[PDB]
Design an enzyme around this catalytic site. Structure first.
Site, PDB file in Angstrom:
ATOM      1  N   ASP A 159     -42.744  12.798  35.519  1.00 41.30           N
ATOM      2  CA  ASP A 159     -43.862  13.084  34.647  1.00 41.30           C
ATOM      3  C   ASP A 159     -43.522  13.104  33.162  1.00 41.30           C
ATOM      4  O   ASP A 159     -43.625  14.139  32.504  1.00 41.30           O
ATOM      5  CB  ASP A 159     -44.503  14.400  35.047  1.00 41.30           C
ATOM      6  CG  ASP A 159     -45.793  14.652  34.307  1.00 41.30           C
ATOM      7  OD1 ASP A 159     -46.646  13.740  34.298  1.00 41.30           O
ATOM      8  OD2 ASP A 159     -45.952  15.758  33.737  1.00 41.30           O
ATOM      9  N   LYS A 161     -44.321  12.068  29.355  1.00 40.85           N
ATOM     10  CA  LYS A 161     -45.458  11.798  28.450  1.00 40.85           C
ATOM     11  C   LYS A 161     -45.322  12.757  27.263  1.00 40.85           C
ATOM     12  O   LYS A 161     -44.768  13.848  27.415  1.00 40.85           O
ATOM     13  CB  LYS A 161     -46.787  12.060  29.157  1.00 40.85           C
ATOM     14  CG  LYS A 161     -46.988  13.501  29.558  1.00 40.85           C
ATOM     15  CD  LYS A 161     -48.169  13.657  30.499  1.00 40.85           C
ATOM     16  CE  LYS A 161     -48.294  15.098  30.955  1.00 40.85           C
ATOM     17  NZ  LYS A 161     -49.265  15.283  32.053  1.00 40.85           N
ATOM     18  N   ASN A 164     -45.729  16.694  27.636  1.00 35.97           N
ATOM     19  CA  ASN A 164     -44.755  17.589  28.259  1.00 35.97           C
ATOM     20  C   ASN A 164     -43.446  17.695  27.489  1.00 35.97           C
ATOM     21  O   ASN A 164     -42.454  18.232  27.993  1.00 35.97           O
ATOM     22  CB  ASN A 164     -44.459  17.145  29.688  1.00 35.97           C
ATOM     23  CG  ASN A 164     -45.568  17.504  30.648  1.00 35.97           C
ATOM     24  OD1 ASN A 164     -45.930  18.683  30.797  1.00 35.97           O
ATOM     25  ND2 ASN A 164     -46.113  16.493  31.318  1.00 35.97           N
ATOM     26  N   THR A 194     -48.975  10.597  35.264  1.00 33.58           N
ATOM     27  CA  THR A 194     -50.039  10.572  34.272  1.00 33.58           C
ATOM     28  C   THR A 194     -50.370   9.115  34.066  1.00 33.58           C
ATOM     29  O   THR A 194     -49.548   8.372  33.558  1.00 33.58           O
ATOM     30  CB  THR A 194     -49.554  11.160  32.958  1.00 33.58           C
ATOM     31  OG1 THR A 194     -49.300  12.555  33.138  1.00 33.58           O
ATOM     32  CG2 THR A 194     -50.588  10.964  31.869  1.00 33.58           C
TER      33      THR A 194
END
Ligand SMILES: Nc1ncnc2c1ncn2[C@@H]1O[C@H](COP(=O)(O)OP(=O)(O)NP(=O)(O)O)[C@@H](O)[C@H]1O
Ligand SMILES: [Mn+2]
Lengths: 343, 159
Positions: A159, A161, A164, A194
């Site tokens: 994850d 992006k 984060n 995402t």
């Protein structure tokens, strides 16, 4: 130079022996809700929210992620939930956000992380429009080393992006959200992440590995340097069509090495994507674009960040947008307690 | 260039990894109606990449959904884990939201929706009340994932 500046073989040997150890033996109920002042909601997720908090007795601030067991259970993403806790509490890396403690009650699961008043790179990236290749590269070298770290333990973050990525008091990245962090022996399947960051192997249920984090790296570097993500559209389905097609265009300002390193990171054939070939991560550490990088310094955080957020004092919650504060009450009745006994 | 920005959330499907048994050993082709799907899908993403083998086994995975009128196939807000396809009948589209709740479309013996629930769960984008009697085609996300996943695990990879 390149991958010969820093010798990391012995380090990842101990790091692996230290992670297997903490993973097999966690810590339960190391804190209590009635010990923290819910200052403000820093961010809302799907199963909960992260609220700034202050321990009544310590007067200390931390980021608190809250999770509605029932919802978790409801949505069936109960496994990642447990993995997020256990894996996070099991790692240690300069660019990895730390967890202080955790506990649970009749309705929720609480993870108490250190607070990073810096905000999400997303808040700054969106405000500053786009960063210089130098500035962007500075954050990249940090992900490359964390992905090397994390992957050697046979973990997949899943994850990446701007959202984060926390920028701390020195301008360095603190990866947060281990909601999709999972340990992988050979390959895994859960479609997750995402949209604008999902690799082609995930979208199409093709079984994937540590090579999807490297793909996300090529996207991140892109969005940092370009301003916008490489694959964008209204319908996420319109996004998945493009990611799969894989065709991308580059800002005319993008230098020639950035374009070369992204062509290898955003490579649809994973048996050709950088970070996943014979030399692994090294191809990345020896790519022309990373020619001016001092890995040893980067690791020791011995390099001046090209940008440090405005930081007042204890509790500064300005680098963060605002969120609909919606009070949380435990319960006189425990819900799905046998399905979280590990927490 | 570009635009459309705003903090992005995280998508996530249900947890899954085969390696089990593989028991088993198909709905009524309806043949004529059959062509409708194999044509209304030649536009869908997770379908366009499929193998004929996976395609075939996928058409049969879809059950038959019936609805008279004043009926609601998909309520705006619902989690939903099914992909549907109009086969017969008429349906209207109430984008009920923004504050009010008007109307915005007409589906009639053609048109499909919910393609985004074949990948993960997500809030229905609009209420689709039936102006039918009409017959729809639905496909469970799980039912679907297993078909694809079980097939792809068999494929030999280069380690
Ligand atoms: N250690 C931290 N310090 C400061 N802010 C934090 C910290 N951890 C999380 N946040 C903030 O809280 C937001 C939400 O946390 P997050 O864990 O990402 O929610 P989530 O449930 O994972 N939803 P999503 O990110 O879409 O999957 C983040 O985007 C950050 O802005
Ligand atoms: Mn998350």
């Amino acid at each position: 130079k390149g991958s010969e500046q820093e010798s990391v073989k012995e380090f990842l040997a101990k790091a692996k022996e230290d992670f297997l150890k903490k993973w097999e033996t966690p810590s339960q109920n190391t804190a209590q809700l009635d010990q923290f002042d819910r200052i403000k909601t820093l961010g809302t997720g799907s199963f909960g929210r992260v609220m700034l908090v202050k321990h009544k007795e310590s007067g200390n601030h931390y980021a608190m992620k809250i999770l509605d067991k029932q919802k978790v259970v409801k949505l069936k993403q109960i496994e990642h939930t447990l993995n997020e806790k256990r894996i996070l509490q099991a790692v240690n890396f300069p660019f990895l956000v730390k967890l202080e403690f955790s506990f649970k009650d009749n309705s929720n699961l609480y993870m108490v992380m250190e607070y990073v008043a810096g905000g999400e790179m997303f808040s700054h990236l969106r405000r500053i429009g786009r960063f210089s290749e130098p500035h962007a590269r500075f954050y990249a070298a940090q992900i490359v080393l964390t992905f090397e770290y994390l992957h050697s333990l046979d973990l997949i973050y899943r994850d990446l992006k701007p959202e984060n990525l926390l920028i701390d008091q020195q301008g360095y990245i603190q990866v947060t959200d281990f909601g999709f962090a999972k340990r992988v022996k050979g390959r895994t399947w859960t479609l997750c992440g995402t949209p604008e960051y999902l690799a082609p192997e995930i979208i199409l249920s093709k079984g994937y590995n540590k090579a999807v984090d490297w793909w996300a790296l090529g996207v991140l570097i892109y969005e940092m340097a370009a301003g916008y993500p490489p694959f964008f559209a209204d319908q996420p389905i319109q996004i998945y069509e493009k990611i799969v097609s894989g065709k991308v265009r580059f800002p005319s300002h993008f230098s020639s090495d950035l374009k070369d390193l992204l062509r290898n990171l955003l490579q649809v054939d994973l048996t050709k994507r950088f970070g996943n070939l014979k030399n692994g991560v090294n191809d990345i550490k020896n790519h022309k674009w990373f020619a001016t990088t001092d890995w040893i310094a980067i690791y020791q955080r011995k390099v001046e960040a090209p940008f440090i957020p405005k930081f007042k004092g204890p509790g500064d919650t300005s680098n963060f947008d605002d969120y609909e504060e919606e009070e949380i009450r435990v319960s006189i009745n425990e819900k799905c307690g046998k399905e979280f006994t590990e927490f | 260039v570009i635009n459309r920005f705003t903090r992005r959330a995280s998508v996530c499907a249900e947890a899954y990894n085969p390696d089990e048994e593989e028991d088993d050993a198909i709905h009524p082709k309806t043949d004529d109606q059959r062509n409708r799907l194999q044509e209304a899908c030649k536009d869908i993403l997770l379908f366009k990449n499929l193998d004929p083998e996976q395609m075939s086994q996928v058409l049969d995975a879809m059950f038959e959904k019936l609805v008279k009128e004043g009926e609601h196939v998909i309520d705006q807000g619902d989690d939903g884990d099914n992909f549907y396809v109009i086969d017969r009948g008429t349906f209207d589209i109430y984008v009920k939201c923004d504050g009010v709740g008007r109307c915005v479309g007409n589906y009639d013996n053609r048109g499909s929706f919910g393609e985004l629930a074949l990948m993960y769960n997500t809030p229905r984008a609009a209420t689709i009340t039936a102006t039918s009697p009409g017959a729809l085609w639905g496909l469970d996300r799980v039912t679907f994932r297993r078909i694809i996943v079980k097939n792809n695990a068999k494929k030999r990879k280069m380690y």
